[PDB]
Structure formats: C-alpha cells, structure tokens
C-alpha cells in the first residue's frame, strides 16, 4: 500500500455553518442595526422610530480544481482519489481562514479589522496583548481571558478557539511565577482540549505569533462564518487528451465569508 | 458553417441572451366620498 505524508485535517469545516447550495451564489441577509425604539412620551408625536437597514452578503461559490496526470501493485484510481480529496479538504481550509477575494473564498482574517470598543459592523474586533513580540510579560493569559469576555454572552454558548499548533504551544508554555503551567498543569496531562471552558481548533492555516499577526481567533462560527458549498466531487476519468497520462479531472465548488461580524474576535499581538 | 470550421470557427458564436425586466408597477385610484353622501343616497355608492 502506497504511503503519503500525513497532513493536518482540521479545517474549520466542522465549526462553521455548512449550507448546501445549488445556484451560483448564496445570499445571506443580515440587518446592520437595531429597531431604535424609544420610551414614548404621553404627549408627543411618536412616529417612525427607525428601521434596520438590511444588507446582502454574497457567497460567490467559487470552484476548486486540481489536475494530476496519471502517467498493478497499488492501484492509482483509489489512491489518487484518496489524495485529491485530502488536498481539497486542506486547500479550502486556507481559503476559509486567510483567503482573499479573487476566485476563492475570503477568509475571516481578511475583513478590515478594527480594535474592539470602537467596533462597527463592517469589520472584526480584536484585543491587543501588550508587547509586539509575544504575550504580555507581566500577566500572560490576560489577553486570552479578556478576548473571551470581550465577545458577547449570546455567542459564547457554543464558541471555539482557532489556532495553529505552535500557537497552542505558546499558550501551553504559559506558566505562573513558580512555573506550574496554567493550562494542563503537569507534564503528564496532555492536550486538555477545553481552553477556558471552550473547545480548541488547531487549524494550521492561522498565522503564528509575530509582530502584528492575529494568531488566535475565538467565536461562534456557526453564526459567524458561512461555508456554502455543493457536496459532490466531480470525477472526470478522462481517457483522452494524453494517451501517456490519464490526467484525471477533479473539482469541488465551494465559497464562503463571514456572515456575522460580531461572532469572531481576534487577538492582536501588539499594543 | 461548412468550410469556416477549418479556418476559423474554433467555437461557434453562442446566443448572447438578454433579460428584459417587467418592473410591475401598481395602478391605484383613491376617490374621496363624503360620509353624508354615503348615508343619504338610495343608490349604493359604496358598491357603485
């Protein structure tokens, strides 16, 4: 049996809202503001209090394609089908997190972030850690806990952290003034998988800790990020074009950006 | 075409389609009747 390198599988697919769509695009419809109702006066005109301005966000439903040429110990049809499904499960994971606008789903990091407390609708909110290189030196994890408690109590019913491996490394490297590992205290524990009472998703397409990078996200992505897709995978078992190489054609179409800008909060490693 | 496939016609020009919108306006009339006239007349003006 032919082996391959085992890549990361966690993909933000299982915590975001997966919607089977059949058309060319998926239009989510979110109001931007409140009703604005006031307490009425007993002798006043009292008319036209306000109306929420709605907004259509378009999931463009892009397509993803990989085209390998095939060029009896192991059987290529099953193996290449088990590799290209993995690559389509992994290459859309980068687009879900840091994809840009052109021909691919725009990830939640590329949505013009604004510091929380001055949060408006068109952006995502972040909280600063302190010094630019890493977590704060005096009190580590204060950035983590106020990232949790700067989101909103309705979305924190089912919210999760999104990191890569070597940011969860730097989280588990946090220790008290005796060096006793605030998260998973002993050297015998392991991954506790319940950071601050919330699950952790190790998604490798997140950036690592840098001068300004947003290496930790937290949110109810079921309301936040909408993955609209078509469930099938095209299989053109092509017997033409090149006699020498089969050149199988496999494509899945998928789209997605943020549906709710209030659900996702980011951790900026700066001041 | 017949011989144009050899020289050109690598693709045949597809029909460029066009959407014509019916804007669907409304036709509304609001005549004003009096309450005195609606009550005095033997003729049912409200159904006329």
């Amino acid at each position: 049996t032919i082996r391959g390198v085992l890549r990361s599988t966690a993909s933000l697919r299982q915590i975001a809202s997966v919607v089977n769509v059949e058309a060319t695009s998926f239009d989510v419809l979110v109001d931007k503001t409140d009703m604005g109702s006031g307490w009425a006066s007993e002798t006043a005109a009292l008319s036209e209090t306000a109306t929420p301005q709605i907004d259509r966000i378009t999931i463009p439903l892009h397509e993803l394609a990989a085209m390998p040429k095939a060029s009896s110990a192991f059987d290529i049809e099953t193996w290449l089908a088990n590799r290209i499904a993995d690559k389509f499960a992994r290459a859309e994971a980068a687009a879900f997190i840091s994809g840009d606008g052109v021909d691919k789903p725009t990830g939640f990091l590329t949505k013009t972030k604004v510091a929380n407390g001055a949060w408006a609708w068109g952006s995502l909110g972040y909280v600063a850690t302190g010094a630019a290189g890493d977590f704060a030196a005096v009190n580590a994890s204060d950035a983590v806990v106020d990232l949790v408690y700067a989101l909103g109590a309705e979305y924190r019913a089912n919210a999760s952290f999104v990191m890569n491996s070597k940011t969860a490394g730097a989280v588990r490297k946090m220790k008290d003034a005796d060096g006793r590992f605030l998260w998973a205290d002993s050297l015998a524990a392991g991954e506790p998988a319940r950071l601050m009472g919330y699950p952790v998703l190790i998604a490798e397409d997140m950036p690592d800790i840098a001068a300004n990078a947003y290496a930790i996200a937290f949110g109810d992505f079921g309301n936040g990020y909408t993955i609209a897709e078509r469930p099938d995978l095209r299989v053109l078992r092509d017997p033409f074009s090149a006699k020498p190489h089969v050149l199988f054609y496999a494509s899945k179409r998928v789209g997605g950006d943020v549906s709710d800008f209030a659900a996702i909060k980011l951790l900026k490693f700066a001041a | 075409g017949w011989a144009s496939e050899t020289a050109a016609l690598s693709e045949t020009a597809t029909p460029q389609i066009d959407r014509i919108t019916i804007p669907l306006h409304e036709l509304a009339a609001m005549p004003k009747a009096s309450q005195r006239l609606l009550d005095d007349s033997a003729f049912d003006i409200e159904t006329w």
């Binding site: - | 017949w2 011989a3 144009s4 496939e5 050899t6 020289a7």
Partner: protein, 194 residues
C-alpha cells in the same frame, strides 16, 4: 495528376562556376568559357536524374499539380516532397470558369509526407468533369547554397560522370552517388487500397 512545372530553373542559379572548379578544367586561361554551354547541360541532366530517384526538387521552382479526383477522402499527399506555401488550389469547372478557393485546406509540411490535409473533414469538392490544379512552390531553397550539401555533392558526383564519359561505357565508393541519394529517397511500403 499531371504535375508539370510552371517555370524552370533560371540557369544562373546553377553553380556552373563551382562545377568548373570541381571538374579540374583549368585556372587562369584566357578562354575559360568554352564549356559554359555544356557544363550546365550536364548539371540540369544530373539534377533531373536525382529529382526522380529521390522525388525532391532542389531549386524551389514553381509547380502546377493538375488533378481531377482526390486520391483519398481528405489527405492528398503531393509528389514533389520539400514544399512550402501552396499558392492556389484554384478549382476549375467542367469547362472554363476557374475559381480560386481558400476552401479551408491546410498544408502539413514534411520532407516525407507533404500533405495538403483539409480541416473541414472534406477537401473542396470537384465539379464532375473538371480538374483541380494546385499551384505550389516546392524545393529546398532559391539559390544553390540553401541545399543540403550531401545532395549537392551527389549532383557533382553525377554530373562530373556525364562530363567524363559521353556514351554508356562501363567503369564502389563508400558514399558514392547512390549512398548519398538514399537518405533522400521516399521509403514506402503500401501497395494497398488506402
């Protein structure tokens, strides 16, 4: 399929002044020109011998290929092999009217198979009782210098022979006349229907 030539070679394009260097006539005589009328008579007699054994052309004079029915449904391999830029497949009618046709025909260059394959899966049809002449200029180059030199040597090995013996008098080289010709002959193994 008649395959005549529109124009012959000019004669001034033949290397009579270099063939005279080959045959060791003489260097600095004041006459120097008593053989010019006959040296190109043997160069044209040795090129035309090698143009028939090789089915090549060698001076790129213009041809006229007047034929009536197509040999195969679409291909029409041309006889004179090294071709370039088929001018005109003017389709004559039963009598008179000659209408040149762009017709959607291509040209596949090759030294072995100089086809004229059509792109619309059928060459232009032929008016019953009328021919389809094809003007094309086929050969290696315009001047003598554009030839493959081994084929140019096979003219000089052969036209020197006609100059040295006049009648058919009998008289083994590694690369003789024949061994230089043989990579330019047409190697065919079909005697079939298609």
């Amino acid at each position: 399929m008649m395959l005549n030539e529109v124009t012959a070679v000019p004669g001034t394009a033949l290397p009579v002044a270099e063939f005279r260097d080959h045959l060791r006539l003489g260097t600095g005589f004041a006459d120097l020109g008593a053989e010019d009328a006959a040296l190109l008579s043997y160069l044209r007699a040795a090129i035309a011998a090698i143009e028939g054994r090789t089915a090549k052309a060698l001076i790129s004079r213009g041809f006229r290929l007047a034929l009536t029915a197509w040999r195969w449904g679409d291909m029409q391999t041309l006889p004179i092999a090294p071709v370039a830029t088929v001018t005109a497949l003017r389709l004559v009618d039963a009598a008179g009217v000659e209408t040149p046709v762009a017709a959607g025909w291509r040209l596949v260059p090759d030294m072995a198979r100089p086809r004229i394959e059509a792109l619309g899966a059928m060459l232009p049809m032929i008016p019953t009782g009328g021919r389809v002449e094809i003007d094309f200029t086929a050969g290696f180059g315009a001047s003598w210098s554009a030839l493959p030199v081994d084929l140019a040597q096979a003219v000089f090995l052969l036209a020197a022979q006609y100059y040295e013996l006049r009648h058919d008098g009998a008289a083994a080289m590694p690369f003789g006349v024949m061994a230089l010709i043989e990579r330019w002959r047409t190697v065919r193994v079909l005697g079939g229907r298609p």
